Design a protein around this ligand. Structure first.
Ligand SMILES: N#Cc1ccc(-c2cnc3nnc(Cc4c[nH]c5ncccc45)n3n2)cc1
Length: 289
């Protein structure tokens, strides 16, 4: 039982902007549509019925941890962009941690979407998805929000094939445990093969380290969801990058798009493109298709 009186009153006020009453939400706990460390995602119906995704935080039982998670993620309610996942609300109840209610993404996560062999997305399709992500990140960057876990697995596709940058704020979790490792300076699970060289060294994340991650995501897109550096152990990712080595050009990646990838992985953060610049460059490449 999570008591609101215990939480900081400023946090309570922010949360009360988006509260959803229990009688307004039906959750199908027998229908898992995603699995996280803090809890699973379930088919839900928000009431006029709306199909939604209900993310559980029930594995978080300590009130201090719940409070911190809400604090870090509530800013989500202040964002609005076609390429950024929105928050429908938060359901507080009598037993259990708060439920995070999110728009349902009918086509699931971007990585599994492009890996699906029946889909067989074209080069044009994939660059298009990459451009959508760039626009979403341009928006987040304009709000000075640093994502810290951008990857194809963490972007979703809705019923109209609009890509939503996801897995941030109240939706944050590890949705595929295979790609998080404790072999890093923090000793906690991190997406080390998506991280900028300087984040691995200094444990700091910036919009420019998000740009690095976006480069990796572009590589994922053009390989149709191949895992990056399959032949590099998590023990070696830092020295691999220090040696100047980088992901190789995907067979079906246009030369100019690979140049963009390489720019995202420049060892000096300040030399890497802004997301504004990425949108411009990728838009031109897309238009030639
Ligand atoms: N397999 C798989 C898989 C399932 C879910 C995600 C994922 C990645 N980032 C996220 N950010 N928020 C969510 C939850 C979510 C919102 N809407 C959804 N619609 C369907 C399935 C899950 C959701 N997610 N979910 C990634 C991989």
């Amino acid at each position: 039982h999570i008591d609101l009186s215990a939480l900081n009153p400023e946090l309570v006020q922010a949360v009360q902007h988006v509260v959803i009453g229990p009688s307004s939400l039906i959750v199908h706990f027998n229908e898992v549509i995603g699995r996280g460390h803090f809890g699973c995602v379930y088919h839900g119906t928000l009431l006029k019925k709306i199909h939604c995704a209900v993310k559980s935080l029930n594995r978080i039982t300590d009130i201090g941890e719940v409070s911190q998670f809400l604090t870090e993620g509530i800013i989500m309610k202040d964002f609005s962009h076609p390429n950024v996942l929105s928050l429908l609300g938060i359901c507080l109840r009598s037993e259990g941690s708060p439920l995070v209610v999110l728009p349902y993404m009918k086509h699931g996560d971007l990585r599994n979407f492009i890996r699906n062999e029946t889909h067989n997305p074209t080069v044009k399709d994939l660059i298009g998805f990459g451009l959508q992500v760039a626009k979403g990140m341009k928006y987040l960057a304009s709000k000075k929000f640093v994502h810290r876990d951008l990857a194809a697995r963490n972007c979703m596709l809705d019923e109209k094939f609009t890509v939503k940058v996801a897995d941030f704020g109240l939706a944050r979790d590890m949705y595929d445990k295979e790609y998080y490792s404790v072999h890093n300076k923090t000793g906690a699970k991190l997406p080390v093969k998506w991280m900028a060289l300087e984040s691995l060294q200094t444990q700091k994340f910036t919009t420019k380290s998000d740009v690095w991650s976006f480069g990796v995501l572009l590589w994922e897109l053009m390989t149709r969801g191949a895992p990056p550096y399959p032949d590099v152990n998590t023990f070696d990712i830092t020295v691999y990058l220090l040696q100047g080595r980088r992901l190789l050009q995907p067979e079906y990646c246009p030369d100019p798009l690979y140049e963009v990838m390489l720019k995202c992985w420049h060892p000096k953060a300040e030399m890497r493109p802004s997301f504004s610049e990425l949108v411009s460059r990728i838009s031109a490449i897309f238009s030639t298709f």
